[PDB]
Write a structure and sequence with these properties.
This protein has 235 residues and is an alpha/beta fold. Helix content is 34%, strand content 18%.
């Protein structure tokens, strides 16, 4: 996705960059976002990028603050790099969900993330439409704020895609001990959308959490997930 200077400026602005910040850009294609980020007084900018052509583009930028890391942003442990990291990226559609999930695993060191994603992905994460496990996983740890609507640009070849900028702001709503276990919990409850919760979770447990056993996962609120999870979380 080629992005306008105005939209790129907004994205960088949403990070609220100040002196001493470490920013982590997830993807380096193209270095237009990189250049805009470097117009702010950040201390260090990590760019997580593997693509050889995209890494060549970054090489020509001589800024001492820029360090390219050749790894997969969908699998990279961000917290291995720093205790406080602002994460940003114009995310490709095939990896956007995996990158966002990975950011969440690293919630302990990511106070703020700003992403451009497809419109439908933004809507899902906010819990507005077709809410899936990832939406609940994110919102357990972040507020998902809608920042910008990014319609397809006029001079872009088909297929025309509607995008949005979203901002994840740290706001932990449950002190989950084991994120991997929490993901399992969410994936189990969302699996087989058509099946009533009775058929996935023991009725007695649902009743104890104040959940209708004959509800579909669509009926659950954020608080519902927490009410049920505190009942099964190991001590």
């Amino acid at each position: 996705l080629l992005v306008s200077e105005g939209v790129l400026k907004k994205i960088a602005e949403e990070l609220n960059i100040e002196e001493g910040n470490t920013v982590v850009e997830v993807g380096g294609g193209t270095g237009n976002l990189t250049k805009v980020l470097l117009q702010h007084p950040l201390k260090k900018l990590y760019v997580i990028e593997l693509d050889r052509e995209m890494v060549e583009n970054l090489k020509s930028i001589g800024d001492e603050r820029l360090e390219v890391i050749n790894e997969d942003a969908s699998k990279f442990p961000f917290c291995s790099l720093g205790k406080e990291l602002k994460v940003v990226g114009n995310l490709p559609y095939n990896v956007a969900s995996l990158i966002i999930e990975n950011t969440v695993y690293n919630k302990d060191c990511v106070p703020l993330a700003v992403f451009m994603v497809q419109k439908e992905v933004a809507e899902k994460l906010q819990g507005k439409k077709d809410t899936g496990w990832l939406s609940v996983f994110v919102r357990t740890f972040y507020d998902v704020n809608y920042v910008m609507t990014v319609p397809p640009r006029f001079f872009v070849p088909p297929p025309k895609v509607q995008s949005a900028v979203i901002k994840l702001v740290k706001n932990e709503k449950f002190p989950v001990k084991d994120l991997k276990n929490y993901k399992k919990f969410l994936t189990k409850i969302f699996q087989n959308r058509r099946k009533v919760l009775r058929k996935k979770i023991p009725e007695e447990l649902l009743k104890e959490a104040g959940i209708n056993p004959d509800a579909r996962v669509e009926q659950l609120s954020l608080e519902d997930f927490f009410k049920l999870y505190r009942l099964i979380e190991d001590s």
